[PDB]
Amino acid sequence: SGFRKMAFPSGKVEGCMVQVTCGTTTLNGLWLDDVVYCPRHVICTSEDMLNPNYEDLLIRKSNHNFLVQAGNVQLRVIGHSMQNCVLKLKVDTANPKTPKYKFVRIQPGQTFSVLACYNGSPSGVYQCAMRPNFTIKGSFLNGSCGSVGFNIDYDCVSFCYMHHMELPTGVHAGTDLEGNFYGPFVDRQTAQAAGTDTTITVNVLAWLYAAVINGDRWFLNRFTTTLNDFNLVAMKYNYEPLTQDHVDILGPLSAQTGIAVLDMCASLKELLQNGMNGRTILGSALLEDEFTPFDVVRQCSGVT
Amino acid sequence: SGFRKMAFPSGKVEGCMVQVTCGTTTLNGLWLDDVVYCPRHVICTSEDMLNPNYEDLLIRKSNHNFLVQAGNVQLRVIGHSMQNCVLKLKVDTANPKTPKYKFVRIQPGQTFSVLACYNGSPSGVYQCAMRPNFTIKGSFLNGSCGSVGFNIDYDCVSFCYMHHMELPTGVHAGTDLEGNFYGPFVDRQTAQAAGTDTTITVNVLAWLYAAVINGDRWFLNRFTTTLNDFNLVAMKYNYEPLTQDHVDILGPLSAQTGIAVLDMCASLKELLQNGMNGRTILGSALLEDEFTPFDVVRQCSGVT
Numbered sequence: 254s255g256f257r258k259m260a261f262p263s264g265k266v267e268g269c270m271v272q273v274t275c276g277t278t279t280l281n282g283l284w285l286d287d288v289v290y291c292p293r294h295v296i297c298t299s300e301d302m303l304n305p306n307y308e309d310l311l312i313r314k315s316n317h318n319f320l321v322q323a324g325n326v327q328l329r330v331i332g333h334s335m336q337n338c339v340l341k342l343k344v345d346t347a348n349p350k351t352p353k354y355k356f357v358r359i360q361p362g363q364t365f366s367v368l369a370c371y372n373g374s375p376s377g378v379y380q381c382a383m384r385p386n387f388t389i390k391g392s393f394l395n396g397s398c399g400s401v402g403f404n405i406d407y408d409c410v411s412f413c414y415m416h417h418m419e420l421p422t423g424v425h426a427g428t429d430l431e432g433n434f435y436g437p438f439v440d441r442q443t444a445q446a447a448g449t450d451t452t453i454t455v456n457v458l459a460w461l462y463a464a465v466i467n468g469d470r471w472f473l474n475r476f477t478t479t480l481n482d483f484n485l486v487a488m489k490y491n492y493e494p495l496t497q498d499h500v501d502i503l504g505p506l507s508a509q510t511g512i513a514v515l516d517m518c519a520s521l522k523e524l525l526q527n528g529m530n531g532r533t534i535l536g537s538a539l540l541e542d543e544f545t546p547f548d549v550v551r552q553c554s555g556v557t
Numbered sequence: 558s559g560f561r562k563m564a565f566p567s568g569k570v571e572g573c574m575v576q577v578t579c580g581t582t583t584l585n586g587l588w589l590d591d592v593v594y595c596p597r598h599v600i601c602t603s604e605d606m607l608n609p610n611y612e613d614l615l616i617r618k619s620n621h622n623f624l625v626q627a628g629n630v631q632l633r634v635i636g637h638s639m640q641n642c643v644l645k646l647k648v649d650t651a652n653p654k655t656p657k658y659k660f661v662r663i664q665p666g667q668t669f670s671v672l673a674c675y676n677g678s679p680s681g682v683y684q685c686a687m688r689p690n691f692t693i694k695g696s697f698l699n700g701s702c703g704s705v706g707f708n709i710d711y712d713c714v715s716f717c718y719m720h721h722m723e724l725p726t727g728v729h730a731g732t733d734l735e736g737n738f739y740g741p742f743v744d745r746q747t748a749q750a751a752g753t754d755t756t757i758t759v760n761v762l763a764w765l766y767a768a769v770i771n772g773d774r775w776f777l778n779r780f781t782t783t784l785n786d787f788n789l790v791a792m793k794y795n796y797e798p799l800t801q802d803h804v805d806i807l808g809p810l811s812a813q814t815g816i817a818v819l820d821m822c823a824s825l826k827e828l829l830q831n832g833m834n835g836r837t838i839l840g841s842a843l844l845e846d847e848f849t850p851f852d853v854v855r856q857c858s859g860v861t
């Protein structure tokens with residue numbers, strides 16, 4: 254009973270968080286095996302951030318200029334390299350708390366947990382979704398850079414995000430663990446506007462199934478629709494177009510509840526056209542889009 | 558920038574989660590030092606739960622009947638006792654992952670993180686508030702019993718909740734770590750109705766300050782009010798009466814934003830009387846009450 258915005262247990266990621274200092278800049282690093290991963294803008298002074306030449310800035314940096322501290326102990330830096338927008342600091346000690354891990358580049362609409370950190374120390378954990386415009390709506394302050402996004406499959410941690418910057422609109426941008434930014438963002442203190450933030454339709458549908466599973470059924474109606482009819486409504490409300498791939502992934506939820514995917518689309522259609530009329534769904538007064546169909550199945554079944 | 562329902566990093570609590578089996582019932586336990594804490598209804602069969610006599614049921618139980626498994630290794634049970642609604646299983650090994658900890662009995666309106674577990678394994682973490690009617694709106698399924706609620710102050714884990722049951726309304730009830738239930742609930746499969754769930758006024762105000770801090774200011778108005786005038790409105794909308802203690806705790810937020818507590822009460826008053834008019838505050842279309850003033854300060858400052 255009940256449905257919550259749930260994050261993965263963060264322990265496996267906490268054991269990887271370190272502090273990286275370069276000059277007078279301090280941010281977070283991720284220590285996996287004998288490598289420390291961090292945003293390359295750690296080599297920048299706030300003045301350098303206006304228009305940085307990272308290759309030229311990195312020439313003036315030696316292994317001894319990168320201070321890596323894990324808890325209270327110093328790690329010895331024996332190598333350094335730049336991979337896209339991340340720095341890889343080879344250290345002489347493999348992290349003994351290295352969990353089973355993978356680096357994955359997620360698709361927009363997918364969800365993940367963020368372990369927000371400051372000075373290599375964890376402050377909190379929350380569940381996020383990579384928006385369709387490739388930004389994340391996080392909670393990050395100065396010093397949070399290098400905090401990572403991840404998913405967990407039993408004992409394996411799939412790292413998918415590393416925080417790099419805050420856009421002037423207060424939304425967040427970052428990279429995968431290979432240093433490639435999600436979206437068109439560059440690691441530069443220049444105004445970068447985000448594109449249209451559309452709603453993750455498949456996720457809203459997944460959450461509507463979660464609501465039915467937990468007792469909130471007022472929104473179920475006597476109607477059905479088609480993929481094309483629904484998508485006309487989805488376009489008007491800046492919802493992502495729904496495809497047969499999306500319908501396919503909603504299959505287990507449709508099977509559990511006995512509510513056909515297109516009937517749920519018709520419930521969503523009427524909700525979009527008429528609003529909630531002062532009512533709530535799973536304690537929310539708006540349509541939630543940060544639960545994937547996989548998240549709903551996992552939470553509603555108790556996968557650990 | 559940004560404001561999220563953030564949970565504490567769960568690592569310190571994950572290291573304490575164990576599986577407790579008694580007969581054919583399996584639930585979670587909390588292993589701290591050489592003691593395992595779990596709901597006493599682990600000794601019950603589903604038939605026993607209808608009207609259990611825990612003292613009589615525990616007579617038929619020996620130390621060897623309690624199977625405690627930490628990860629994949631078995632702990633030897635050398636003692637057992639009942640303290641209110643919890644069982645304390647003395648084991649022969651102190652948990653090496655025991656963090657610095659305290660047992661605290663929280664007040665309604667206070668928040669905490671929950672590490673939902675099944676078979677001694679963590680599935681996820683979320684932030685909760687103890688409702689004024691002493692229930693929690695969690696996400697728990699069968700097997701989640703023994704999952705704990707906690708807060709963290711730097712390196713110290715304050716355990717405040719242990720999950721015991723789901724009311725017929727889908728809301729959750731449980732105890733502090735001394736086994737005393739929050740609210741009037743008993744550990745019996747008997748219909749127990751919850752009282753009125755009022756809104757945690759001080760928390761909504763704290764969240765309104767968080768919204769101002771993060772840029773959402775549309776709700777600020779040209780009005781002020783008094784504690785008595787505001788409380789007349791609070792009573793009509795089933796909001797908890799605001800006291801000078803509440804005003805005192807909002808002081809740092811009032812000081813940071815330059816918005817007097819009573820002016821923020823007047824913004825809240827108008828929001829209660831006129832609704833949000835289709836608008837949102839911190840991405841929410843309703844007034845959020847599961848952030849205390851301490852949570853807002855912690856998140857808006859980056860305490861780790």
Ligand SMILES: Cc1ccncc1NC(=O)[C@H](C)c1cncc(Cl)c1
Nearest residue numbers: 294393394395417418419440441442
């Ligand atoms: C201030 C802040 C708050 C939240 N998240 C990240 C930050 N830090 C930043 O946004 C820093 C100052 C930055 C600027 N321009 C480009 C990059 Cl890659 C990085």
Ligand SMILES: Cc1ccncc1NC(=O)[C@H](C)c1cncc(Cl)c1
Nearest residue numbers: 598697698699721722723744745746
């Ligand atoms: C089914 C379930 C779901 C979520 N949370 C707890 C549960 N378990 C329960 O509510 C159990 C069956 C229970 C019954 N009556 C009294 C107590 Cl103390 C315990």
